[PDB]
Amino acid sequence: APKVIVFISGSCLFGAISRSLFKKLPIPYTVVLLILGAILGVVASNVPLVEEHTRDVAHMDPHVLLQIFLPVLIFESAFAMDVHTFMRSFSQVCILALFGLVVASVLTAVLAMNLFNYNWNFSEAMMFGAIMSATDPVAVVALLKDLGASKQLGTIIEGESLLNDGCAIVIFNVFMKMVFFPQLTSTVGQNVLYFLQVAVAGPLWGYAVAKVTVFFLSHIFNDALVEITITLAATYLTYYIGDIWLEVSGVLAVVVLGLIVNAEKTSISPEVEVFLHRFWEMLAYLANTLIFMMVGVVVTQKALVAVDKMDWFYLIILYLAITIIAGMVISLFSPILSRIGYGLTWRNAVIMTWGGLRGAVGLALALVVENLAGNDVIGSKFLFHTAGIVVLTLVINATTIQTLLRILGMSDISIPKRLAMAGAVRRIHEGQNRTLNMLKSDRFLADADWDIATAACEISDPSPREFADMMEEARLRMLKAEKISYWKQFEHGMLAREALRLLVQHAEVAADEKDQFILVDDLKKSWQIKGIYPWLKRKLEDLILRLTKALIPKLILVVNGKINNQLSLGYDVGKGYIIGEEEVGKIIDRMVDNKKILRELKHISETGRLQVVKELGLLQREHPGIAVSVKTRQAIRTILNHSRETIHELQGAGLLDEMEAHKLELTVEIKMKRLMNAPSSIPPPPPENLLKNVSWLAGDMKLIDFIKARASLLHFDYGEVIVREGDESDGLFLIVSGLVKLYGKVFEDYLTVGNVIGEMGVLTKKPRNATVTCETTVQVYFITAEDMNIAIDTFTLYPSLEYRLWRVVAIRIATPLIMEQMAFQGWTQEKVKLHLERGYLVDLAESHFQFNIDATLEDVILINGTAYNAHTREEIRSPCLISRTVHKLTFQYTATEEPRLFVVRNA
């Protein structure tokens, strides 16, 4: 009877002990596992009882490693990394990893044939070279996360290592079949059919199974067990069919399935995702520790008997050669990746050629060769060299990668993240100190030992020359302010993960730029990359065997989704840059003191803002329906994010527990899941629908009837001028289609479909502010001024039309004042807009044209009329913010400027 319980339980215990002991040291814990296996091998060789309890797991069948261990390791490597970043980098990852592995394998094989004194064939040498080009990603990314360096390097290394592992597995299988089973014959047609099966139909089978699984899982809400069991059964069935089809080369199907499933954010709830990740992590951890123990035992028992000093010399030579050829291939193929438009730096390449740590895939393949060789010495040589190379890499490269990162300067921390962390932990410490001072004076806790409490309230704490000086300080100021603004926008819930990554990466790239602060052309490449052949295919299918007829409309949906996935990123990037520039425009005046410097800074910032807003406007013009769809998605996403923030704030006030927190977060996540299933092609609304969607027109059917019965459609062509400066306010416009340029006294702005021009001209009855000119063929809605006066005099409800118009223009006027006057550390544009939305407009007629100032209200803004105060005879003219010290506001009644105040109350 085989005995396996003691070995596996002892391996679990040894893995735990070695994991805990060597966490602080930079050397990985797996070399300790190999050492323990070696000691156990000596003991089992010299003691028969330990041999009886060791040999059943130490020398297993090679099909255990080929059919159980290796698929688990490779699938966990695929399943434990980000998928969207891999998709964004695959165009270079594929070519780099595949051709680098091919050249490295061929060079190592040639070195084995011509330098090693063993009379090895070409197939044995190619098996040898495929074994020793198979890196380990998890150790490298653990080191990178521990050192806190850039994550783009981490995901690039992860993708390169996964492709290396897959190609090495395929090449090893192909040459093992030739070396150990020579009865099988090969022809050119059979070889090309085998390549077509392995490289094309395998991943296609995995893709199909993953798609069917995700389609089935979408129909299931709030069921973790069903999702977990269905995902695991689909994984097993994919592996099983691919296995009985392609032997060891059928791992690409489950690799593709893992990549597809890991990218799911709607059909699979986050708790299911974290359970599946921990499940596969534990399985791969067990396989790793078992493999290292048995390779230690077998190396000690068999390999070290038949080695000489020449084998050690060959080991050192091979260790030098693999690093040299890796550096050679990366240096040779770096210019080719540079010419394609997505290159890599020099420091990143230096880290890349050094972080090639070998792992358990090569050790498993060497164990397979050792089992299959039998009494031949080739298996012993394979195991000796593979174990030596693994030990040398884990001993040298793992310790020197942190040294190289420190020397090369990639270990620095980003300033906004450090500032946010420091502010959070200092706020935590101040709150804890306040709690301590509260507790020390308690009537009941007046007898405790306060030394323990004071020790336990501690956090882990995670001339033209001067002109050039101020201009470089201003450049640094814009860089850091843009960085913190983009971070705040992401934290509020505006920017997406990909959009935030692109924005901060471009900011880091452009920090060293001196000609321009932020180039609009890179952002243009970010959003103006549509028009790709999917769009032409969609047009062709629109202008265009019964199953083919049924399948034709089903590609329209998928190509619409493909266009949407890029339009959303482009819109997010452009909107984030616009909001960041608008936020930095306010704080840059207070801190920059040189008049000419701030003049040219404002000039370049303004012109960049006009270019990005114009480009976004024409981009919306080009693709209407997908634009409407992504705008709706963004609106509902922001609504859900603010609901989540409301839940968190209610938790922070001590009014709701984690049970109800999960209960309401589940409803929010369900709403998000049903949102992501919405159609991605909403047709553009008719102009009457947009007229019914005006902010100060909704809620009153008779108002919309009155407006639509007496409004006019006006069409304008290129270059037309609708209104000019100083003209009498003829009426209120509404841009319902096209782009329009509003410029004059000397500001500029570009307005699009859905905006209203002339609210202030109709309400306050002053002439036009600036000249409005044409850009495209614009259709607008026209309502005359006398029309609007009649409409104002008609409706007199509690939310009257005049009140709504004045509230809209009041928030519009008061947002810059509130933002500029209280631009503290943490006052963003959206926070100011929401705070003003919490306010209301005060009618002073009911208060006998007088107003008091309390302490509960936060802001009081004078927007129309002139404010007076008998106390010290204060006089304030609109538009201005009322000072905190004025306590009485008296107003006069005059027909030219009615007194209108906008106040904000607190909770």
Ligand X SMILES: C[C@@H]1CC[C@@]2(OC1)O[C@H]1[C@@H](O)[C@H]3[C@@H]4CC[C@H]5C[C@@H](O[C@@H]6O[C@H](CO)[C@H](O[C@@H]7O[C@H](CO)[C@@H](O)[C@H](O[C@@H]8OC[C@@H](O)[C@H](O)[C@H]8O)[C@H]7O[C@@H]7O[C@H](CO)[C@H](O)[C@H](O[C@@H]8O[C@H](CO)[C@@H](O)[C@H](O)[C@H]8O)[C@H]7O)[C@H](O)[C@H]6O)[C@H](O)C[C@]5(C)[C@H]4CC[C@]3(C)[C@H]1[C@@H]2C
Ligand Y SMILES: CCCCCCCC/C=C\CCCCCCCC(=O)O[C@@H](COC(=O)CCCCCCCCCCCCCCC)COP(=O)([O-])OCC[N+](C)(C)C
Crossing angle between the packed helical segments 251-262 and 151-180, to the nearest 10 degrees: 160
- Which of 68, 110, 201, 841 binds ligand X (CB under 6 A)? It is 68
114 is annotated as contributing to ligand binding: no
- How is residue 889 annotated by DSSP? E
Residue 67 interacting entry, from ligand Y, ligand X, a copy of itself, none, C-beta within 5 to 8 Å by type: ligand Y
Tell me which residue of 303, 281, 314 sits closest to 118, measured CA to CA: 314
Residue 72 contacts ligand X per CB under 6 A: yes
Residue 75 contacts ligand Y per CB under 6 A: yes
Residue 75 interacting entry, from ligand Y, ligand X, a copy of itself, none, C-beta within 5 to 8 Å by type: ligand Y
CB of 440 to a copy of itself, least distance (A): 5
Nearer of residues 475 and 501 to a copy of itself, judged by Cβ: 501
The answer to whether 761 touches 666, Cβ cutoff 8 Å, is: no
Residue type, position 855, single letter: A
Burial of 64 (0-12, 13-18, 19+ CB in 10 A): middle
Q: Binding mask 244-283 vs ligand Y (x if CB under 6 A, - otherwise)?
A: ----------x-----------------------------
Nearer of residues 11 and 397 to a copy of itself, judged by Cβ: 11
Residue 6 contacts ligand X per CB under 6 A: no
Nearer of residues 280 and 851 to ligand X, judged by Cβ: 280
The answer to whether 154 touches 141, Cβ cutoff 8 Å, is: yes
Crossing angle between the packed helical segments 346-354 and 309-339, to the nearest 10 degrees: 150
Residue 49 interacting entry, from ligand X, a copy of itself, ligand Y, none, C-beta within 5 to 8 Å by type: none
CB of 183 to ligand X, least distance (A): 23
- Which of 42, 50, 51, 67 binds ligand Y (CB under 6 A)? It is 67
348 is annotated as contributing to ligand binding: no
How far, in Å, CA of 15 to CA of 23, rounded? Answer: 12
CA distances from 442 to 437, 445, 450, 458, 578 (A): 9, 5, 12, 21, 52
CB of 2 to ligand X, least distance (A): 3
CB of 115 to ligand X, least distance (A): 36
- Which of 34, 44, 72, 882 binds ligand Y (CB under 6 A)? It is 72
458 is annotated as contributing to ligand binding: no
How far, in Å, CA of 447 to CA of 444, rounded? Answer: 8
Residue 508 contacts ligand Y per CB under 6 A: no
Q: Which long-range contacts (CB under 8 A, 24 or more apart) does 400-407 make?
A: 400/354, 401/140, 401/143, 401/351, 401/354, 401/355, 402/26, 402/143, 402/147, 404/350, 404/351, 404/354, 405/147, 405/149, 405/351
Gap sites in the chain (C to N > 2.5 Å), preceding residue numbers: 462, 544, 745
CB of 257 to ligand X, least distance (A): 17
Residue 635 interacting entry, from ligand Y, ligand X, a copy of itself, none, C-beta within 5 to 8 Å by type: a copy of itself
SS3 327: helix
Q: Binding mask 21-60 vs ligand X (x if CB under 6 A, - otherwise)?
A: ------------------------------------x--x
Residue whose tokens read 């208060």: 847
CB of 63 to ligand Y, least distance (A): 4
Nearer of residues 281 and 858 to ligand X, judged by Cβ: 281
SS3 731: strand
Question: Dihedral through CA 148, CA 150, CA 154, CA 156, nearest 10?
Answer: -170
267-296 binders of ligand X (CB under 6 A): 283, 286-287, 290
# of chain residues touching ligand X (CB under 6 A): 13
Residue 135 contacts ligand Y per CB under 6 A: no
CA distances from 275 to 283, 460, 480, 668 (A): 12, 28, 39, 21
The answer to whether 633 touches 625, Cβ cutoff 8 Å, is: no
Residue 2 interacting entry, from ligand Y, a copy of itself, ligand X, none, C-beta within 5 to 8 Å by type: ligand X
Residue 11 contacts ligand Y per CB under 6 A: no
Residue 1 contacts ligand X per CB under 6 A: yes
Q: Which stretch binds ligand Y (CB under 6 A): 61-69, 661-669, 685-693, 732-740?
A: 61-69
Query: Left if phi > 0, otherwise alpha if psi is -120 to 50, otherwise beta: which for 719?
Result: left
The answer to whether 507 touches 486, Cβ cutoff 8 Å, is: yes
What is the Rg, in whole angstroms, of the alpha carbon atoms belonging to the chain? 35
Residue 71 interacting entry, from ligand Y, ligand X, a copy of itself, none, C-beta within 5 to 8 Å by type: ligand Y
Q: Per DSSP, what are the bridge partners of residue 778?
A: 716
Output the six-digit token pair for 673.
């899941």
Residue nearest to ligand X (CB): 2
Residues making contact with ligand Y (CB under 6 A): 61, 63-64, 67-68, 71-72, 75, 232, 235-236, 239, 254
Binding residues for 3',5'-cyclic AMP: 758, 760-761, 768-769
Binding residues for 3',5'-cyclic GMP: 758-760, 768-769
Residues making contact with ligand X (CB under 6 A): 1-2, 4, 8, 57, 60, 64, 68, 72, 283, 286-287, 290
